[PDB]
Write an enzyme that holds these catalytic residues in place. Structure first.
Site, PDB file in Angstrom:
ATOM      1  N   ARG A 210       2.556  -1.506   0.000  1.00 16.65           N
ATOM      2  CA  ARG A 210       1.564  -1.323   1.091  1.00 16.65           C
ATOM      3  C   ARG A 210       0.164  -0.980   0.555  1.00 16.65           C
ATOM      4  O   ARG A 210      -0.801  -1.146   1.302  1.00 16.65           O
ATOM      5  CB  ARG A 210       1.991  -0.194   2.079  1.00 16.65           C
ATOM      6  CG  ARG A 210       2.044   1.197   1.436  1.00 16.65           C
ATOM      7  CD  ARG A 210       2.590   2.340   2.297  1.00 16.65           C
ATOM      8  NE  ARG A 210       2.802   3.545   1.473  1.00 16.65           N
ATOM      9  CZ  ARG A 210       3.948   3.845   0.860  1.00 16.65           C
ATOM     10  NH1 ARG A 210       5.005   3.057   0.993  1.00 16.65           N
ATOM     11  NH2 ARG A 210       4.035   4.922   0.087  1.00 16.65           N
ATOM     12  N   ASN A 211       0.052  -0.500  -0.713  1.00 17.88           N
ATOM     13  CA  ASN A 211      -1.217  -0.063  -1.303  1.00 17.88           C
ATOM     14  C   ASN A 211      -1.839  -1.031  -2.313  1.00 17.88           C
ATOM     15  O   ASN A 211      -2.779  -0.671  -3.000  1.00 17.88           O
ATOM     16  CB  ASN A 211      -1.062   1.337  -1.888  1.00 17.88           C
ATOM     17  CG  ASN A 211      -0.851   2.381  -0.785  1.00 17.88           C
ATOM     18  OD1 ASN A 211      -1.377   2.276   0.325  1.00 17.88           O
ATOM     19  ND2 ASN A 211      -0.039   3.382  -1.032  1.00 17.88           N
TER      20      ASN A 211
ATOM     21  N   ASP B 154       0.010   7.172  -5.525  1.00 16.41           N
ATOM     22  CA  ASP B 154       0.587   6.565  -4.308  1.00 16.41           C
ATOM     23  C   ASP B 154       0.786   5.059  -4.482  1.00 16.41           C
ATOM     24  O   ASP B 154       0.444   4.253  -3.610  1.00 16.41           O
ATOM     25  CB  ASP B 154      -0.212   6.909  -3.026  1.00 16.41           C
ATOM     26  CG  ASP B 154       0.582   6.783  -1.710  1.00 16.41           C
ATOM     27  OD1 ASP B 154       1.692   6.165  -1.719  1.00 16.41           O
ATOM     28  OD2 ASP B 154       0.102   7.299  -0.679  1.00 16.41           O
TER      29      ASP B 154
ATOM     30  N   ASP C 298      -6.055   1.608  -2.592  1.00 19.48           N
ATOM     31  CA  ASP C 298      -5.724   2.956  -2.137  1.00 19.48           C
ATOM     32  C   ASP C 298      -5.933   4.048  -3.223  1.00 19.48           C
ATOM     33  O   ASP C 298      -5.080   4.906  -3.408  1.00 19.48           O
ATOM     34  CB  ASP C 298      -4.303   2.997  -1.554  1.00 19.48           C
ATOM     35  CG  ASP C 298      -3.967   4.329  -0.911  1.00 19.48           C
ATOM     36  OD1 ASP C 298      -4.776   4.808  -0.090  1.00 19.48           O
ATOM     37  OD2 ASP C 298      -2.911   4.912  -1.264  1.00 19.48           O
TER      38      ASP C 298
ATOM     39  N   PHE D 124      -6.086  -0.187   9.314  1.00 21.68           N
ATOM     40  CA  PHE D 124      -6.672   0.361   8.089  1.00 21.68           C
ATOM     41  C   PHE D 124      -7.761   1.430   8.371  1.00 21.68           C
ATOM     42  O   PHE D 124      -8.438   1.894   7.445  1.00 21.68           O
ATOM     43  CB  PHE D 124      -7.244  -0.761   7.194  1.00 21.68           C
ATOM     44  CG  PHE D 124      -6.285  -1.827   6.707  1.00 21.68           C
ATOM     45  CD1 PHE D 124      -5.301  -1.528   5.770  1.00 21.68           C
ATOM     46  CD2 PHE D 124      -6.433  -3.150   7.105  1.00 21.68           C
ATOM     47  CE1 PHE D 124      -4.441  -2.523   5.291  1.00 21.68           C
ATOM     48  CE2 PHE D 124      -5.579  -4.145   6.620  1.00 21.68           C
ATOM     49  CZ  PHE D 124      -4.591  -3.825   5.712  1.00 21.68           C
ATOM     50  N   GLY D 125      -7.899   1.821   9.634  1.00 21.76           N
ATOM     51  CA  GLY D 125      -8.905   2.785  10.072  1.00 21.76           C
ATOM     52  C   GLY D 125     -10.224   2.100  10.374  1.00 21.76           C
ATOM     53  O   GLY D 125     -10.238   0.937  10.784  1.00 21.76           O
ATOM     54  N   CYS D 126     -11.348   2.791  10.161  1.00 21.52           N
ATOM     55  CA  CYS D 126     -12.624   2.147  10.436  1.00 21.52           C
ATOM     56  C   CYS D 126     -13.159   1.412   9.212  1.00 21.52           C
ATOM     57  O   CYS D 126     -14.013   1.921   8.470  1.00 21.52           O
ATOM     58  CB  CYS D 126     -13.647   3.099  11.054  1.00 21.52           C
ATOM     59  SG  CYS D 126     -14.118   4.486   9.993  1.00 21.52           S
ATOM     60  N   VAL D 127     -12.601   0.199   8.998  1.00 25.65           N
ATOM     61  CA  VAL D 127     -12.993  -0.730   7.929  1.00 25.65           C
ATOM     62  C   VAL D 127     -13.527  -1.964   8.639  1.00 25.65           C
ATOM     63  O   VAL D 127     -12.814  -2.584   9.439  1.00 25.65           O
ATOM     64  CB  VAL D 127     -11.857  -1.070   6.935  1.00 25.65           C
ATOM     65  CG1 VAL D 127     -12.378  -1.927   5.794  1.00 25.65           C
ATOM     66  CG2 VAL D 127     -11.205   0.197   6.387  1.00 25.65           C
TER      67      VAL D 127
ATOM     68  N   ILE E  71     -11.458  -4.942  10.257  1.00 24.72           N
ATOM     69  CA  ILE E  71     -10.550  -5.737   9.461  1.00 24.72           C
ATOM     70  C   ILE E  71      -9.131  -5.214   9.737  1.00 24.72           C
ATOM     71  O   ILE E  71      -8.907  -4.003   9.731  1.00 24.72           O
ATOM     72  CB  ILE E  71     -10.933  -5.652   7.944  1.00 24.72           C
ATOM     73  CG1 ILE E  71     -12.278  -6.398   7.698  1.00 24.72           C
ATOM     74  CG2 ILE E  71      -9.796  -6.224   7.064  1.00 24.72           C
ATOM     75  CD1 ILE E  71     -12.949  -6.159   6.319  1.00 24.72           C
ATOM     76  N   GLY E  72      -8.200  -6.137   9.934  1.00 26.13           N
ATOM     77  CA  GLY E  72      -6.787  -5.831  10.139  1.00 26.13           C
ATOM     78  C   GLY E  72      -6.460  -5.115  11.435  1.00 26.13           C
ATOM     79  O   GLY E  72      -5.602  -4.224  11.450  1.00 26.13           O
TER      80      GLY E  72
HETATM   81  C1  LIG Z   1     -10.013   0.589   1.941  1.00 20.24           C
HETATM   82  O1  LIG Z   1      -9.312  -0.148   2.945  1.00 20.24           O
HETATM   83  C2  LIG Z   1      -9.412  -1.516   2.960  1.00 20.24           C
HETATM   84  C3  LIG Z   1      -8.657  -2.044   4.010  1.00 20.24           C
HETATM   85  C4  LIG Z   1      -8.610  -3.416   4.219  1.00 20.24           C
HETATM   86  C5  LIG Z   1      -9.328  -4.245   3.362  1.00 20.24           C
HETATM   87  N1  LIG Z   1      -9.473  -5.594   3.318  1.00 20.24           N
HETATM   88  N2  LIG Z   1     -10.286  -5.982   2.294  1.00 20.24           N
HETATM   89  C6  LIG Z   1     -10.652  -4.873   1.677  1.00 20.24           C
HETATM   90  C7  LIG Z   1     -10.090  -3.730   2.299  1.00 20.24           C
HETATM   91  C8  LIG Z   1     -10.130  -2.346   2.100  1.00 20.24           C
END
Ligand SMILES: COc1ccc2[nH]ncc2c1
Length: 282
Positions: A151-152, A147, A165, A35-38, A30-31
């Site tokens: 952005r969060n 935080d 976050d 957002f890292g490994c999401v 995702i994204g």
């Molecule tokens: C915890 O990080 C995330 C990042 C992108 C995200 N998209 N929908 C939920 C979600 C969660």
């Protein structure tokens, strides 16, 4: 897994998603990695309805003591549910997984910066009110975010803002690189003592409101992060954004009072902002 304490395993059962209830698409992030490994996933509820979810793989968890602390955080966070706070759908016990609701419109800062999107001043204040409602909920549970920033926060398919976050959704922007390696939102006393409270989240909320009203401008662009403490001690503050109503700017200034006890509570912020929002046609 067999080495897990049985009373802890019994306590976490209501948070645990069985592997037959979750389809994880480890082939699609995702994204675009921002957002890292999401990963995209599909969660099946008791009725068999498909739920689009965001799945985070917790690769930093190795030992059983870390797994056990993760189960506990799953237990605590499963009790945190509010329309303006990102909920935990559950956890899966490869690396342990965190299952979160999928947020169609990504983070709030990117959304308001996006030239294709046209939120009105009313819509912007509405986002701020939704953030204040989510924080009012967290503060009521004595949970300190630490935080809070645009952005969060995330936006779902209905443009519902969710404070994110925190808890098991923390380290939202932690990316892993191959070779490389929030002071402007912090209350003055947090910059001085490294301690955070609900009154320091109020300060951060003031900055988040300023981000909303400037459509995601960076705060204090000309001030070094080191120089922020002196800047604030001189009594300097972010200036009123061009299209920000005067009573809303007054609310922002109240958030940045140097005396933490003098700042409004999130309850007062919800009250004041809801009244401002209701003046707008839409
Ligand atoms: C915890 O990080 C995330 C990042 C992108 C995200 N998209 N929908 C939920 C979600 C969660």
């Amino acid at each position: 897994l067999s080495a897990l304490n049985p009373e802890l395993v019994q306590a976490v059962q209501h948070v645990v998603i069985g592997p037959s209830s979750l389809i994880v698409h480890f082939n699609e992030v995702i994204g675009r990695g921002h957002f890292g490994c999401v990963y995209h996933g599909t969660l099946l509820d008791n009725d068999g309805k498909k739920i689009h979810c965001a799945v985070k793989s917790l690769n930093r968890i190795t030992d059983i003591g870390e797994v056990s602390q993760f189960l506990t955080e799953g237990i605590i966070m499963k009790d945190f549910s509010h329309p303006n706070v990102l909920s935990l759908l559950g956890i899966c016990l490869g690396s342990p997984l965190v299952v979160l609701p999928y947020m169609k419109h990504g983070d709030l800062r990117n959304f308001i910066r996006n030239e294709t999107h046209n939120p009105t001043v009313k819509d912007l204040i509405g986002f701020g009110l939704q953030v204040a409602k989510g924080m009012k909920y967290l503060a009521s549970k004595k949970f300190v975010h630490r935080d809070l920033a645009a952005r969060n926060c995330m936006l779902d398919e209905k443009f519902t803002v969710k404070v994110a976050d925190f808890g098991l959704a923390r380290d939202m922007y932690d990316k892993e690189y191959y070779s490389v390696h929030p002071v402007k939102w912090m209350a003055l006393e947090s910059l001085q003592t490294q301690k955070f409270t609900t009154k320091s989240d109020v300060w951060s909320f003031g900055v988040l409101l300023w981000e909303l009203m400037t459509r995601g401008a960076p705060p204090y662009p000309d001030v070094n992060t080191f120089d922020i403490t002196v800047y604030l001690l001189q009594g300097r503050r972010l200036l009123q954004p061009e299209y920000c109503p005067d009573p809303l700017y007054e609310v922002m200034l109240k958030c940045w009072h140097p005396k933490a006890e003098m700042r409004p509570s999130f309850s007062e912020l919800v009250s004041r902002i809801s009244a401002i929002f209701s003046t707008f046609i839409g």
